[PDB]
mmCIF file of the C-alpha atoms, coordinates in Angstrom:
data_MODEL
# 
_entry.id   MODEL 
# 
loop_
_atom_site.group_PDB 
_atom_site.id 
_atom_site.type_symbol 
_atom_site.label_atom_id 
_atom_site.label_alt_id 
_atom_site.label_comp_id 
_atom_site.label_asym_id 
_atom_site.label_entity_id 
_atom_site.label_seq_id 
_atom_site.pdbx_PDB_ins_code 
_atom_site.Cartn_x 
_atom_site.Cartn_y 
_atom_site.Cartn_z 
_atom_site.occupancy 
_atom_site.B_iso_or_equiv 
_atom_site.pdbx_formal_charge 
_atom_site.auth_seq_id 
_atom_site.auth_comp_id 
_atom_site.auth_asym_id 
_atom_site.auth_atom_id 
_atom_site.pdbx_PDB_model_num 
ATOM 1   C CA . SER A 1 1   ? 0.233  0.061   0.134   1.00 0.00 ? 1   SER A CA 1 
ATOM 2   C CA . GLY A 1 2   ? 3.007  2.806   1.261   1.00 0.00 ? 2   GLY A CA 1 
ATOM 3   C CA . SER A 1 3   ? 4.619  3.661   -2.635  1.00 0.00 ? 3   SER A CA 1 
ATOM 4   C CA . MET A 1 4   ? 1.034  3.377   -4.889  1.00 0.00 ? 4   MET A CA 1 
ATOM 5   C CA . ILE A 1 5   ? 1.666  6.081   -6.884  1.00 0.00 ? 5   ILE A CA 1 
ATOM 6   C CA . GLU A 1 6   ? 5.422  5.133   -7.899  1.00 0.00 ? 6   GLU A CA 1 
ATOM 7   C CA . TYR A 1 7   ? 3.837  1.318   -8.268  1.00 0.00 ? 7   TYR A CA 1 
ATOM 8   C CA . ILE A 1 8   ? 1.239  2.202   -11.068 1.00 0.00 ? 8   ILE A CA 1 
ATOM 9   C CA . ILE A 1 9   ? 4.196  4.026   -13.021 1.00 0.00 ? 9   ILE A CA 1 
ATOM 10  C CA . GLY A 1 10  ? 5.929  0.671   -13.329 1.00 0.00 ? 10  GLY A CA 1 
ATOM 11  C CA . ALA A 1 11  ? 2.890  -1.006  -14.604 1.00 0.00 ? 11  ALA A CA 1 
ATOM 12  C CA . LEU A 1 12  ? 2.440  2.036   -17.398 1.00 0.00 ? 12  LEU A CA 1 
ATOM 13  C CA . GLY A 1 13  ? 5.846  1.326   -18.710 1.00 0.00 ? 13  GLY A CA 1 
ATOM 14  C CA . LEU A 1 14  ? 5.760  -2.274  -19.064 1.00 0.00 ? 14  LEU A CA 1 
ATOM 15  C CA . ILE A 1 15  ? 2.494  -2.485  -19.962 1.00 0.00 ? 15  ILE A CA 1 
ATOM 16  C CA . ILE A 1 16  ? 3.661  -0.057  -23.157 1.00 0.00 ? 16  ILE A CA 1 
ATOM 17  C CA . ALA A 1 17  ? 6.607  -1.902  -23.511 1.00 0.00 ? 17  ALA A CA 1 
ATOM 18  C CA . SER A 1 18  ? 5.430  -5.273  -23.840 1.00 0.00 ? 18  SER A CA 1 
ATOM 19  C CA . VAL A 1 19  ? 2.530  -3.949  -25.939 1.00 0.00 ? 19  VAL A CA 1 
ATOM 20  C CA . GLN A 1 20  ? 4.438  -1.945  -28.721 1.00 0.00 ? 20  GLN A CA 1 
ATOM 21  C CA . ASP A 1 21  ? 7.069  -4.598  -29.595 1.00 0.00 ? 21  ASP A CA 1 
ATOM 22  C CA . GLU A 1 22  ? 14.122 -0.113  -29.721 1.00 0.00 ? 22  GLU A CA 1 
ATOM 23  C CA . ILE A 1 23  ? 12.139 2.195   -27.236 1.00 0.00 ? 23  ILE A CA 1 
ATOM 24  C CA . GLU A 1 24  ? 13.012 -0.548  -25.050 1.00 0.00 ? 24  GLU A CA 1 
ATOM 25  C CA . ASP A 1 25  ? 15.735 0.950   -24.218 1.00 0.00 ? 25  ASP A CA 1 
ATOM 26  C CA . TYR A 1 26  ? 14.015 4.924   -23.533 1.00 0.00 ? 26  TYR A CA 1 
ATOM 27  C CA . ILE A 1 27  ? 11.807 3.701   -20.862 1.00 0.00 ? 27  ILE A CA 1 
ATOM 28  C CA . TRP A 1 28  ? 14.930 1.534   -19.469 1.00 0.00 ? 28  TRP A CA 1 
ATOM 29  C CA . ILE A 1 29  ? 16.049 4.732   -18.354 1.00 0.00 ? 29  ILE A CA 1 
ATOM 30  C CA . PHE A 1 30  ? 13.540 6.593   -17.795 1.00 0.00 ? 30  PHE A CA 1 
ATOM 31  C CA . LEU A 1 31  ? 11.874 4.252   -15.326 1.00 0.00 ? 31  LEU A CA 1 
ATOM 32  C CA . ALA A 1 32  ? 15.183 4.390   -13.263 1.00 0.00 ? 32  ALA A CA 1 
ATOM 33  C CA . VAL A 1 33  ? 15.555 8.523   -13.413 1.00 0.00 ? 33  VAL A CA 1 
ATOM 34  C CA . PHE A 1 34  ? 11.892 9.274   -12.167 1.00 0.00 ? 34  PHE A CA 1 
ATOM 35  C CA . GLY A 1 35  ? 12.163 7.005   -9.913  1.00 0.00 ? 35  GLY A CA 1 
ATOM 36  C CA . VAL A 1 36  ? 15.087 8.259   -8.185  1.00 0.00 ? 36  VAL A CA 1 
ATOM 37  C CA . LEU A 1 37  ? 14.457 11.934  -8.636  1.00 0.00 ? 37  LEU A CA 1 
ATOM 38  C CA . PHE A 1 38  ? 10.932 10.635  -6.936  1.00 0.00 ? 38  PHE A CA 1 
ATOM 39  C CA . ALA A 1 39  ? 13.263 9.340   -4.197  1.00 0.00 ? 39  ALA A CA 1 
ATOM 40  C CA . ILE A 1 40  ? 14.865 12.338  -3.133  1.00 0.00 ? 40  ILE A CA 1 
ATOM 41  C CA . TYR A 1 41  ? 11.140 14.073  -3.122  1.00 0.00 ? 41  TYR A CA 1 
ATOM 42  C CA . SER A 1 42  ? 9.681  11.308  -0.794  1.00 0.00 ? 42  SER A CA 1 
ATOM 43  C CA . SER A 1 43  ? 12.847 12.156  1.339   1.00 0.00 ? 43  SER A CA 1 
ATOM 44  C CA . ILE A 1 44  ? 13.258 15.148  1.782   1.00 0.00 ? 44  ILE A CA 1 
ATOM 45  C CA . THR A 1 45  ? 9.249  15.187  1.950   1.00 0.00 ? 45  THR A CA 1 
ATOM 46  C CA . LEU A 1 46  ? 8.609  12.562  3.753   1.00 0.00 ? 46  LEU A CA 1 
ATOM 47  C CA . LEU A 1 47  ? 11.982 12.968  6.101   1.00 0.00 ? 47  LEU A CA 1 
ATOM 48  C CA . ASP A 1 48  ? 13.132 9.507   6.096   1.00 0.00 ? 48  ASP A CA 1 
ATOM 49  C CA . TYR A 1 49  ? 17.243 8.478   4.726   1.00 0.00 ? 49  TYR A CA 1 
ATOM 50  C CA . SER A 1 50  ? 15.116 5.241   4.200   1.00 0.00 ? 50  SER A CA 1 
ATOM 51  C CA . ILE A 1 51  ? 13.952 5.837   1.556   1.00 0.00 ? 51  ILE A CA 1 
ATOM 52  C CA . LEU A 1 52  ? 16.658 6.979   -0.917  1.00 0.00 ? 52  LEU A CA 1 
ATOM 53  C CA . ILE A 1 53  ? 19.135 4.743   0.463   1.00 0.00 ? 53  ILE A CA 1 
ATOM 54  C CA . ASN A 1 54  ? 16.821 1.313   -0.939  1.00 0.00 ? 54  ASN A CA 1 
ATOM 55  C CA . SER A 1 55  ? 16.482 3.867   -4.531  1.00 0.00 ? 55  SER A CA 1 
ATOM 56  C CA . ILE A 1 56  ? 19.976 4.093   -5.563  1.00 0.00 ? 56  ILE A CA 1 
ATOM 57  C CA . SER A 1 57  ? 21.307 0.597   -3.662  1.00 0.00 ? 57  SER A CA 1 
ATOM 58  C CA . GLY A 1 58  ? 18.459 -1.189  -5.384  1.00 0.00 ? 58  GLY A CA 1 
ATOM 59  C CA . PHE A 1 59  ? 19.453 0.579   -8.605  1.00 0.00 ? 59  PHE A CA 1 
ATOM 60  C CA . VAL A 1 60  ? 23.050 -0.855  -8.097  1.00 0.00 ? 60  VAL A CA 1 
ATOM 61  C CA . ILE A 1 61  ? 22.562 -4.224  -6.747  1.00 0.00 ? 61  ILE A CA 1 
ATOM 62  C CA . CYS A 1 62  ? 20.012 -4.820  -9.912  1.00 0.00 ? 62  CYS A CA 1 
ATOM 63  C CA . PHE A 1 63  ? 22.859 -3.748  -12.205 1.00 0.00 ? 63  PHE A CA 1 
ATOM 64  C CA . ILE A 1 64  ? 25.136 -5.901  -11.042 1.00 0.00 ? 64  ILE A CA 1 
ATOM 65  C CA . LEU A 1 65  ? 23.170 -8.818  -11.710 1.00 0.00 ? 65  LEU A CA 1 
ATOM 66  C CA . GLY A 1 66  ? 21.939 -7.922  -14.881 1.00 0.00 ? 66  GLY A CA 1 
ATOM 67  C CA . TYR A 1 67  ? 25.323 -7.070  -16.200 1.00 0.00 ? 67  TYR A CA 1 
ATOM 68  C CA . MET A 1 68  ? 26.598 -10.127 -14.650 1.00 0.00 ? 68  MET A CA 1 
ATOM 69  C CA . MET A 1 69  ? 23.520 -11.892 -16.414 1.00 0.00 ? 69  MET A CA 1 
ATOM 70  C CA . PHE A 1 70  ? 24.420 -10.076 -19.563 1.00 0.00 ? 70  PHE A CA 1 
ATOM 71  C CA . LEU A 1 71  ? 27.831 -11.302 -19.067 1.00 0.00 ? 71  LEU A CA 1 
ATOM 72  C CA . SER A 1 72  ? 27.219 -14.823 -18.278 1.00 0.00 ? 72  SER A CA 1 
ATOM 73  C CA . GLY A 1 73  ? 25.813 -14.525 -21.854 1.00 0.00 ? 73  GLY A CA 1 
ATOM 74  C CA . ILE A 1 74  ? 22.395 -16.541 -20.235 1.00 0.00 ? 74  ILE A CA 1 
ATOM 75  C CA . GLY A 1 75  ? 20.329 -12.996 -20.069 1.00 0.00 ? 75  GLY A CA 1 
ATOM 76  C CA . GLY A 1 76  ? 20.659 -11.506 -23.038 1.00 0.00 ? 76  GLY A CA 1 
ATOM 77  C CA . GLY A 1 77  ? 17.966 -9.354  -22.934 1.00 0.00 ? 77  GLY A CA 1 
ATOM 78  C CA . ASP A 1 78  ? 15.145 -7.727  -20.426 1.00 0.00 ? 78  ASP A CA 1 
ATOM 79  C CA . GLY A 1 79  ? 17.227 -7.393  -17.541 1.00 0.00 ? 79  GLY A CA 1 
ATOM 80  C CA . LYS A 1 80  ? 17.715 -4.102  -18.439 1.00 0.00 ? 80  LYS A CA 1 
ATOM 81  C CA . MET A 1 81  ? 13.975 -3.213  -17.381 1.00 0.00 ? 81  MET A CA 1 
ATOM 82  C CA . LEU A 1 82  ? 14.719 -5.159  -14.194 1.00 0.00 ? 82  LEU A CA 1 
ATOM 83  C CA . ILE A 1 83  ? 17.030 -2.474  -13.436 1.00 0.00 ? 83  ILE A CA 1 
ATOM 84  C CA . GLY A 1 84  ? 14.987 0.542   -14.073 1.00 0.00 ? 84  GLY A CA 1 
ATOM 85  C CA . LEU A 1 85  ? 12.505 -0.997  -11.977 1.00 0.00 ? 85  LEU A CA 1 
ATOM 86  C CA . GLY A 1 86  ? 14.537 -2.023  -9.581  1.00 0.00 ? 86  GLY A CA 1 
ATOM 87  C CA . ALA A 1 87  ? 15.896 1.751   -8.685  1.00 0.00 ? 87  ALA A CA 1 
ATOM 88  C CA . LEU A 1 88  ? 11.941 2.941   -8.326  1.00 0.00 ? 88  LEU A CA 1 
ATOM 89  C CA . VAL A 1 89  ? 9.957  0.033   -7.076  1.00 0.00 ? 89  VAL A CA 1 
ATOM 90  C CA . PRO A 1 90  ? 12.119 -1.606  -5.014  1.00 0.00 ? 90  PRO A CA 1 
ATOM 91  C CA . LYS A 1 91  ? 10.161 -2.586  -2.151  1.00 0.00 ? 91  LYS A CA 1 
ATOM 92  C CA . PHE A 1 92  ? 6.329  -3.167  -2.454  1.00 0.00 ? 92  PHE A CA 1 
ATOM 93  C CA . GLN A 1 93  ? 3.748  -5.127  -0.181  1.00 0.00 ? 93  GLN A CA 1 
ATOM 94  C CA . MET A 1 94  ? 4.452  -8.181  -0.681  1.00 0.00 ? 94  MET A CA 1 
ATOM 95  C CA . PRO A 1 95  ? 3.742  -11.899 1.424   1.00 0.00 ? 95  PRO A CA 1 
ATOM 96  C CA . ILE A 1 96  ? 6.820  -13.743 2.063   1.00 0.00 ? 96  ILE A CA 1 
ATOM 97  C CA . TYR A 1 97  ? 6.718  -17.380 2.987   1.00 0.00 ? 97  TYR A CA 1 
ATOM 98  C CA . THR A 1 98  ? 9.863  -18.900 2.282   1.00 0.00 ? 98  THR A CA 1 
ATOM 99  C CA . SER A 1 99  ? 13.771 -18.630 3.872   1.00 0.00 ? 99  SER A CA 1 
ATOM 100 C CA . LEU A 1 100 ? 14.862 -17.587 1.076   1.00 0.00 ? 100 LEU A CA 1 
ATOM 101 C CA . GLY A 1 101 ? 12.102 -14.711 1.338   1.00 0.00 ? 101 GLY A CA 1 
ATOM 102 C CA . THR A 1 102 ? 13.293 -13.756 3.952   1.00 0.00 ? 102 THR A CA 1 
ATOM 103 C CA . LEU A 1 103 ? 16.816 -13.180 2.705   1.00 0.00 ? 103 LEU A CA 1 
ATOM 104 C CA . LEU A 1 104 ? 15.496 -10.936 -0.575  1.00 0.00 ? 104 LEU A CA 1 
ATOM 105 C CA . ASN A 1 105 ? 13.471 -9.087  2.021   1.00 0.00 ? 105 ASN A CA 1 
ATOM 106 C CA . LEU A 1 106 ? 16.207 -6.901  3.735   1.00 0.00 ? 106 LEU A CA 1 
ATOM 107 C CA . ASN A 1 107 ? 17.469 -3.605  4.335   1.00 0.00 ? 107 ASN A CA 1 
ATOM 108 C CA . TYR A 1 108 ? 18.945 -2.342  0.504   1.00 0.00 ? 108 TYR A CA 1 
ATOM 109 C CA . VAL A 1 109 ? 18.092 -5.143  -1.246  1.00 0.00 ? 109 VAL A CA 1 
ATOM 110 C CA . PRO A 1 110 ? 15.148 -4.436  -3.731  1.00 0.00 ? 110 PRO A CA 1 
ATOM 111 C CA . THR A 1 111 ? 13.223 -7.225  -3.101  1.00 0.00 ? 111 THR A CA 1 
ATOM 112 C CA . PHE A 1 112 ? 10.261 -6.280  -5.233  1.00 0.00 ? 112 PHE A CA 1 
ATOM 113 C CA . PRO A 1 113 ? 11.979 -6.060  -8.207  1.00 0.00 ? 113 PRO A CA 1 
ATOM 114 C CA . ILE A 1 114 ? 13.806 -9.364  -8.041  1.00 0.00 ? 114 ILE A CA 1 
ATOM 115 C CA . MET A 1 115 ? 11.200 -10.648 -7.241  1.00 0.00 ? 115 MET A CA 1 
ATOM 116 C CA . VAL A 1 116 ? 9.201  -9.135  -10.018 1.00 0.00 ? 116 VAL A CA 1 
ATOM 117 C CA . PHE A 1 117 ? 12.244 -11.410 -11.911 1.00 0.00 ? 117 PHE A CA 1 
ATOM 118 C CA . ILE A 1 118 ? 12.187 -14.421 -10.695 1.00 0.00 ? 118 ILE A CA 1 
ATOM 119 C CA . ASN A 1 119 ? 8.394  -14.817 -10.357 1.00 0.00 ? 119 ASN A CA 1 
ATOM 120 C CA . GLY A 1 120 ? 7.824  -13.774 -14.274 1.00 0.00 ? 120 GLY A CA 1 
ATOM 121 C CA . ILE A 1 121 ? 10.701 -16.069 -15.462 1.00 0.00 ? 121 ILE A CA 1 
ATOM 122 C CA . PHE A 1 122 ? 8.840  -19.494 -14.336 1.00 0.00 ? 122 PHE A CA 1 
ATOM 123 C CA . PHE A 1 123 ? 5.499  -17.799 -15.860 1.00 0.00 ? 123 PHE A CA 1 
ATOM 124 C CA . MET A 1 124 ? 7.886  -18.437 -19.003 1.00 0.00 ? 124 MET A CA 1 
ATOM 125 C CA . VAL A 1 125 ? 7.716  -21.810 -18.623 1.00 0.00 ? 125 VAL A CA 1 
ATOM 126 C CA . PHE A 1 126 ? 3.758  -22.260 -19.836 1.00 0.00 ? 126 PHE A CA 1 
ATOM 127 C CA . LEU A 1 127 ? 4.947  -20.409 -23.266 1.00 0.00 ? 127 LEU A CA 1 
ATOM 128 C CA . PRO A 1 128 ? 5.727  -23.415 -24.635 1.00 0.00 ? 128 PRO A CA 1 
ATOM 129 C CA . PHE A 1 129 ? 2.487  -25.046 -23.775 1.00 0.00 ? 129 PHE A CA 1 
ATOM 130 C CA . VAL A 1 130 ? 0.801  -21.768 -24.784 1.00 0.00 ? 130 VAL A CA 1 
ATOM 131 C CA . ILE A 1 131 ? 1.918  -22.624 -27.739 1.00 0.00 ? 131 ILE A CA 1 
ATOM 132 C CA . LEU A 1 132 ? 1.710  -25.844 -27.986 1.00 0.00 ? 132 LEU A CA 1 
ATOM 133 C CA . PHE A 1 133 ? -2.364 -24.934 -28.160 1.00 0.00 ? 133 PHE A CA 1 
ATOM 134 C CA . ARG A 1 134 ? -2.363 -22.072 -30.207 1.00 0.00 ? 134 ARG A CA 1 
ATOM 135 C CA . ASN A 1 135 ? -1.019 -24.308 -32.426 1.00 0.00 ? 135 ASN A CA 1 
ATOM 136 C CA . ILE A 1 136 ? -3.536 -27.146 -32.014 1.00 0.00 ? 136 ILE A CA 1 
ATOM 137 C CA . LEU A 1 137 ? -6.186 -24.389 -32.165 1.00 0.00 ? 137 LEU A CA 1 
ATOM 138 C CA . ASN A 1 138 ? -4.348 -23.178 -35.305 1.00 0.00 ? 138 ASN A CA 1 
ATOM 139 C CA . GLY A 1 139 ? -5.800 -25.983 -37.040 1.00 0.00 ? 139 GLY A CA 1 
ATOM 140 C CA . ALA A 1 140 ? -1.708 -27.370 -37.158 1.00 0.00 ? 140 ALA A CA 1 
ATOM 141 C CA . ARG A 1 141 ? -0.909 -31.114 -36.937 1.00 0.00 ? 141 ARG A CA 1 
ATOM 142 C CA . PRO A 1 142 ? 2.616  -32.944 -37.044 1.00 0.00 ? 142 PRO A CA 1 
ATOM 143 C CA . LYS A 1 143 ? 3.969  -34.985 -39.606 1.00 0.00 ? 143 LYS A CA 1 
ATOM 144 C CA . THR A 1 144 ? 7.766  -35.209 -39.013 1.00 0.00 ? 144 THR A CA 1 
ATOM 145 C CA . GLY A 1 145 ? 10.428 -35.321 -36.279 1.00 0.00 ? 145 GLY A CA 1 
ATOM 146 C CA . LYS A 1 146 ? 11.382 -32.303 -35.348 1.00 0.00 ? 146 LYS A CA 1 
ATOM 147 C CA . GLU A 1 147 ? 7.818  -30.872 -35.637 1.00 0.00 ? 147 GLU A CA 1 
ATOM 148 C CA . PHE A 1 148 ? 6.425  -32.505 -32.406 1.00 0.00 ? 148 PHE A CA 1 
ATOM 149 C CA . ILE A 1 149 ? 8.978  -30.290 -30.733 1.00 0.00 ? 149 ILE A CA 1 
ATOM 150 C CA . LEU A 1 150 ? 8.109  -27.803 -32.922 1.00 0.00 ? 150 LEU A CA 1 
ATOM 151 C CA . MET A 1 151 ? 4.689  -28.270 -32.263 1.00 0.00 ? 151 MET A CA 1 
ATOM 152 C CA . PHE A 1 152 ? 6.065  -26.640 -28.312 1.00 0.00 ? 152 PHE A CA 1 
ATOM 153 C CA . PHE A 1 153 ? 8.413  -23.959 -29.428 1.00 0.00 ? 153 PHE A CA 1 
ATOM 154 C CA . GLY A 1 154 ? 7.172  -22.975 -32.756 1.00 0.00 ? 154 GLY A CA 1 
ATOM 155 C CA . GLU A 1 155 ? 4.185  -21.829 -35.075 1.00 0.00 ? 155 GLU A CA 1 
ATOM 156 C CA . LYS A 1 156 ? 3.141  -23.661 -38.094 1.00 0.00 ? 156 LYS A CA 1 
ATOM 157 C CA . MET A 1 157 ? 1.471  -20.559 -41.201 1.00 0.00 ? 157 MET A CA 1 
ATOM 158 C CA . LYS A 1 158 ? 1.171  -20.369 -44.739 1.00 0.00 ? 158 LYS A CA 1 
ATOM 159 C CA . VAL A 1 159 ? 3.920  -18.463 -46.573 1.00 0.00 ? 159 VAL A CA 1 
ATOM 160 C CA . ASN A 1 160 ? 1.223  -16.087 -47.579 1.00 0.00 ? 160 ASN A CA 1 
ATOM 161 C CA . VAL A 1 161 ? 0.501  -15.273 -44.056 1.00 0.00 ? 161 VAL A CA 1 
ATOM 162 C CA . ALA A 1 162 ? 4.533  -16.150 -43.153 1.00 0.00 ? 162 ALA A CA 1 
ATOM 163 C CA . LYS A 1 163 ? 5.430  -12.754 -45.408 1.00 0.00 ? 163 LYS A CA 1 
ATOM 164 C CA . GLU A 1 164 ? 2.272  -10.880 -44.862 1.00 0.00 ? 164 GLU A CA 1 
ATOM 165 C CA . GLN A 1 165 ? 3.441  -11.026 -40.839 1.00 0.00 ? 165 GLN A CA 1 
ATOM 166 C CA . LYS A 1 166 ? 7.067  -10.785 -42.434 1.00 0.00 ? 166 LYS A CA 1 
ATOM 167 C CA . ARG A 1 167 ? 8.527  -13.573 -39.809 1.00 0.00 ? 167 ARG A CA 1 
ATOM 168 C CA . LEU A 1 168 ? 11.836 -15.426 -38.803 1.00 0.00 ? 168 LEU A CA 1 
ATOM 169 C CA . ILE A 1 169 ? 11.359 -18.361 -41.231 1.00 0.00 ? 169 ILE A CA 1 
ATOM 170 C CA . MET A 1 170 ? 11.954 -21.448 -38.892 1.00 0.00 ? 170 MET A CA 1 
ATOM 171 C CA . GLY A 1 171 ? 12.277 -24.385 -41.079 1.00 0.00 ? 171 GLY A CA 1 
ATOM 172 C CA . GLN A 1 172 ? 10.068 -26.643 -43.286 1.00 0.00 ? 172 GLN A CA 1 
ATOM 173 C CA . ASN A 1 173 ? 9.661  -30.308 -42.578 1.00 0.00 ? 173 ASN A CA 1 
ATOM 174 C CA . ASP A 1 174 ? 12.093 -31.088 -40.850 1.00 0.00 ? 174 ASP A CA 1 
ATOM 175 C CA . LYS A 1 175 ? 14.437 -28.456 -42.250 1.00 0.00 ? 175 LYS A CA 1 
ATOM 176 C CA . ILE A 1 176 ? 14.375 -26.815 -38.869 1.00 0.00 ? 176 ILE A CA 1 
ATOM 177 C CA . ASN A 1 177 ? 16.965 -24.131 -37.564 1.00 0.00 ? 177 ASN A CA 1 
ATOM 178 C CA . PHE A 1 178 ? 15.421 -23.727 -34.251 1.00 0.00 ? 178 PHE A CA 1 
ATOM 179 C CA . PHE A 1 179 ? 17.657 -21.012 -33.582 1.00 0.00 ? 179 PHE A CA 1 
ATOM 180 C CA . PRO A 1 180 ? 16.983 -18.613 -36.656 1.00 0.00 ? 180 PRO A CA 1 
ATOM 181 C CA . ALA A 1 181 ? 18.109 -14.692 -37.285 1.00 0.00 ? 181 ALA A CA 1 
ATOM 182 C CA . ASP A 1 182 ? 19.673 -13.542 -42.977 1.00 0.00 ? 182 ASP A CA 1 
ATOM 183 C CA . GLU A 1 183 ? 17.529 -11.443 -41.538 1.00 0.00 ? 183 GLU A CA 1 
ATOM 184 C CA . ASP A 1 184 ? 14.144 -13.111 -43.085 1.00 0.00 ? 184 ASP A CA 1 
ATOM 185 C CA . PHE A 1 185 ? 16.631 -15.635 -44.561 1.00 0.00 ? 185 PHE A CA 1 
ATOM 186 C CA . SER A 1 186 ? 14.943 -15.578 -48.016 1.00 0.00 ? 186 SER A CA 1 
ATOM 187 C CA . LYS A 1 187 ? 11.474 -16.521 -47.973 1.00 0.00 ? 187 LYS A CA 1 
ATOM 188 C CA . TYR A 1 188 ? 11.878 -18.423 -51.046 1.00 0.00 ? 188 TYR A CA 1 
ATOM 189 C CA . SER A 1 189 ? 8.938  -21.035 -51.481 1.00 0.00 ? 189 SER A CA 1 
ATOM 190 C CA . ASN A 1 190 ? 5.080  -21.437 -52.640 1.00 0.00 ? 190 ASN A CA 1 
ATOM 191 C CA . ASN A 1 191 ? 2.582  -20.285 -51.332 1.00 0.00 ? 191 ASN A CA 1 
ATOM 192 C CA . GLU A 1 192 ? 2.425  -23.297 -48.783 1.00 0.00 ? 192 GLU A CA 1 
ATOM 193 C CA . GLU A 1 193 ? 3.146  -24.004 -44.841 1.00 0.00 ? 193 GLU A CA 1 
ATOM 194 C CA . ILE A 1 194 ? 6.069  -23.070 -42.908 1.00 0.00 ? 194 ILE A CA 1 
ATOM 195 C CA . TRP A 1 195 ? 7.477  -22.363 -39.261 1.00 0.00 ? 195 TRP A CA 1 
ATOM 196 C CA . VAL A 1 196 ? 8.381  -19.821 -38.182 1.00 0.00 ? 196 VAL A CA 1 
ATOM 197 C CA . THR A 1 197 ? 9.402  -17.768 -34.680 1.00 0.00 ? 197 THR A CA 1 
ATOM 198 C CA . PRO A 1 198 ? 6.732  -15.743 -32.982 1.00 0.00 ? 198 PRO A CA 1 
ATOM 199 C CA . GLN A 1 199 ? 7.055  -12.807 -30.979 1.00 0.00 ? 199 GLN A CA 1 
ATOM 200 C CA . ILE A 1 200 ? 5.597  -13.739 -27.607 1.00 0.00 ? 200 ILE A CA 1 
ATOM 201 C CA . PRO A 1 201 ? 7.767  -11.191 -25.806 1.00 0.00 ? 201 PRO A CA 1 
ATOM 202 C CA . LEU A 1 202 ? 9.417  -12.587 -22.439 1.00 0.00 ? 202 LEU A CA 1 
ATOM 203 C CA . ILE A 1 203 ? 8.871  -8.886  -21.910 1.00 0.00 ? 203 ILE A CA 1 
ATOM 204 C CA . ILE A 1 204 ? 4.865  -9.986  -21.175 1.00 0.00 ? 204 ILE A CA 1 
ATOM 205 C CA . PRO A 1 205 ? 5.498  -12.665 -18.231 1.00 0.00 ? 205 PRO A CA 1 
ATOM 206 C CA . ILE A 1 206 ? 6.893  -10.400 -16.017 1.00 0.00 ? 206 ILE A CA 1 
ATOM 207 C CA . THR A 1 207 ? 4.837  -7.855  -16.416 1.00 0.00 ? 207 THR A CA 1 
ATOM 208 C CA . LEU A 1 208 ? 2.053  -10.233 -15.499 1.00 0.00 ? 208 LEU A CA 1 
ATOM 209 C CA . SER A 1 209 ? 3.871  -10.727 -12.771 1.00 0.00 ? 209 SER A CA 1 
ATOM 210 C CA . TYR A 1 210 ? 4.500  -7.222  -12.313 1.00 0.00 ? 210 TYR A CA 1 
ATOM 211 C CA . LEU A 1 211 ? 0.608  -7.432  -10.942 1.00 0.00 ? 211 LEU A CA 1 
ATOM 212 C CA . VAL A 1 212 ? 0.882  -10.606 -10.337 1.00 0.00 ? 212 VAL A CA 1 
ATOM 213 C CA . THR A 1 213 ? 3.735  -11.024 -7.284  1.00 0.00 ? 213 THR A CA 1 
ATOM 214 C CA . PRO A 1 214 ? 2.322  -8.205  -5.154  1.00 0.00 ? 214 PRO A CA 1 
ATOM 215 C CA . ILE A 1 215 ? -0.636 -10.691 -4.336  1.00 0.00 ? 215 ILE A CA 1 
ATOM 216 C CA . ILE A 1 216 ? 1.530  -14.254 -4.749  1.00 0.00 ? 216 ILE A CA 1 
ATOM 217 C CA . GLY A 1 217 ? 5.461  -13.202 -3.583  1.00 0.00 ? 217 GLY A CA 1 
ATOM 218 C CA . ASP A 1 218 ? 7.079  -16.305 -2.097  1.00 0.00 ? 218 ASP A CA 1 
ATOM 219 C CA . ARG A 1 219 ? 4.279  -18.852 -3.184  1.00 0.00 ? 219 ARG A CA 1 
ATOM 220 C CA . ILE A 1 220 ? 5.584  -19.862 -6.072  1.00 0.00 ? 220 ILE A CA 1 
ATOM 221 C CA . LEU A 1 221 ? 8.974  -20.870 -4.532  1.00 0.00 ? 221 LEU A CA 1 
ATOM 222 C CA . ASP A 1 222 ? 8.017  -22.107 -1.673  1.00 0.00 ? 222 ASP A CA 1 
ATOM 223 C CA . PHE A 1 223 ? 5.669  -25.472 -3.630  1.00 0.00 ? 223 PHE A CA 1 
ATOM 224 C CA . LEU A 1 224 ? 8.553  -25.508 -5.984  1.00 0.00 ? 224 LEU A CA 1 
ATOM 225 C CA . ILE A 1 225 ? 10.408 -26.652 -3.182  1.00 0.00 ? 225 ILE A CA 1 
# 
């Protein structure tokens, strides 16, 4: 309940961010700045050096965790918006039910921004299953080997619609490259069926996570341990 006005602004940033899909660069930096500036105002106003400290700290702890996630190559992307969210909304109303939670929850530690990510990553684990159905409902069945694997991670449509939506060619039948990105690598095929990369941006699960975490908190970590 405390830091409400703040929370509402991160939510905006992420919904703009989750929807759009370059501007991902302007948003992250804006969140940090408004956040830091905002803390100054609240601090002097509320008269609590308490506020400012978590903020700066939050920005820092997050820079390190993502820069490391950046470096330990995995993170690849987004670690950045978790960064900015950090120096603004670290710490927000939220239930804890784990030993780790008592830890993630502390003085400087940006609890919510961090939590929003963890709960966010598990969500991404539903994705392949989301696409499994999108594909079922799309009236697509698999005829070959890699297709089954594909059924979970890719979406099948006609080269007409393929080019129409101008997507990344993933492969035909078993000629699948599960990591394609020669641009639209010569879409040279008949107006037939093809496999392509979907655009389900990990940004979403994190935004869903942003909104649900305040209600969920540590529960998922609990059940999964």
